[PDB]
Design a protein around this ligand. Structure first.
Ligand SMILES: CCNc1cc(C(=O)N[C@@H](Cc2ccccc2)[C@H](O)CNC2CCCCC2)cc(N2CCCC2=O)c1
Length: 374
């Protein structure tokens, strides 16, 4: 009953149905593993079809404190409070949770996204105002018997709370350690394009950090890694020349409907640290993931795409376009992230997204940018 409980797309986010308040107010809530605040629109907004009305809830408690939350894209401010929350197509339970009632926002809500709030699924360490504001999933685990784990299959898609659904993946689950519990931080040990090593000190791949983030669209890469990746992808696809603006994500590339030359674009392999010393596994990303379709009836004689790899000064972000086609297990209980090939991964009759291992590295350097436990 939890299968197919997500809707949405990489560009505007994936959301799940929730209720807040007594009596229950149903709202669509974006699932975001890249933040830790539960917040809902709570005042009229041009892009909102509905919003949380605290005056209709007898169980609302005002915490008499404001909160401001900035993201890479968008920001909002609101009033902190608590109320009863349920997930109709998740575990059948009710918990009292912190909720930020958004009263002001800028470039946060997305027109036509069909969601009205956001569910930050990361750890308290990064919650605003501070780590004393318990995140929703922490409250869920504390107040119910739900196992301390959830999994995401982004396609629609599924969020499985408290469990792993075998019907959602094929092959083996490979686990990489959560390096630190704030974001879902992981360690990349190697990057290949077209099978060719980028040949950097592996700490570069994780400067300042690397995270798994369902709330960000793109694969975002540290400047140095991004520039190396673009040069390698350019070289692989050199039979066609694109304007520099495409590579900057500032303009579309279009082909006649159905003629997209997938074969000229390379596969990208990200090797993630394994659970055992000097072992790793890789997840492989097809161009169907990193060239993101942009729907627009005006351009619809063509298929058009944005380049969904982009530069970051805040570390690697493995966003939705990476997570799509994988089943990703956020195993908080065992401090690890699991990857397997998704039942809904898109591909062609030549190449397939993969999760595979084990691979060994002879270089013993810690690929984490920061010294652990300091
Ligand atoms: C789904 C909408 N598309 C996005 C969203 C975000 C973004 O900032 N997402 C937030 C959540 C959010 C969700 C929906 C609307 C606003 C915010 C996440 O917490 C960041 N997590 C952070 C990321 C970095 C700091 C640490 C964790 C960045 C995008 N960008 C920016 C350029 C490339 C790209 O894809 C595209």
């Amino acid at each position: 009953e939890m299968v197919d409980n997500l809707r949405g797309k990489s560009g505007q986010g994936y959301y799940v149905e929730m209720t807040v308040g007594s009596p229950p107010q149903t709202l669509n809530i974006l699932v975001d593993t890249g933040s830790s605040n539960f917040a809902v629109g709570a005042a009229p907004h041009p892009f909102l079809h509905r919003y949380y009305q605290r005056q209709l809830s007898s169980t609302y408690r005002d915490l008499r404190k404001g909160v401001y939350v900035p993201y890479t894209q968008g920001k909002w401010e609101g009033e902190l409070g608590t109320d009863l929350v349920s997930i109709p197509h998740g575990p059948q339970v009710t918990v009292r949770a912190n909720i930020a009632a958004i009263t002001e926002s800028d470039k946060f809500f997305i027109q036509g996204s069909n969601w009205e709030g956001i569910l930050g699924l990361a750890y308290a360490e990064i919650a605003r105002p501070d780590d004393s504001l318990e995140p929703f999933f922490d409250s869920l685990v504390k107040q119910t018997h739900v196992p301390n784990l959830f999994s995401l299959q982004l396609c629609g898609g599924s969020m499985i709370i408290g469990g792993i659904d075998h019907s959602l993946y094929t092959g083996s689950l490979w686990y990489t350690p959560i390096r630190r519990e704030w974001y879902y931080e992981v360690i990349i040990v190697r990057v290949e394009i077209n099978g060719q090593d980028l040949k950097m000190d592996c700490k570069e791949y994780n400067y300042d950090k690397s995270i798994v983030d369902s709330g960000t669209t793109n694969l975002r890469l540290p400047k140095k890694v991004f520039e190396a990746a673009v040069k390698s992808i350019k070289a692989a696809s050199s039979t066609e020349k694109f304007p520099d603006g495409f590579w900057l994500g500032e303009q579309l590339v279009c082909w006649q409907a159905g003629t997209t030359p997938w074969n000229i674009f390379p596969v990208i392999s990200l090797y993630l640290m394994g659970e055992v010393t000097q072992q790793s596994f890789r997840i492989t990303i097809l161009p169907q993931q990193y060239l993101r379709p942009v729907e627009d009836v005006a351009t619809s004689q063509d298929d058009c795409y944005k380049f969904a790899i982009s530069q970051s000064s805040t570390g690697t972000v493995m966003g939705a376009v990476i997570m799509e086609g994988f089943y990703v297990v956020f195993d908080r209980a065992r401090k690890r992230i699991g990857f397997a090939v998704s039942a809904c991964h898109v591909h062609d009759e030549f190449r397939t997204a993969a999760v595979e291992g084990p691979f060994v590295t002879l270089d013993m350097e810690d690929c984490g940018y920061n010294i652990p436990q300091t």
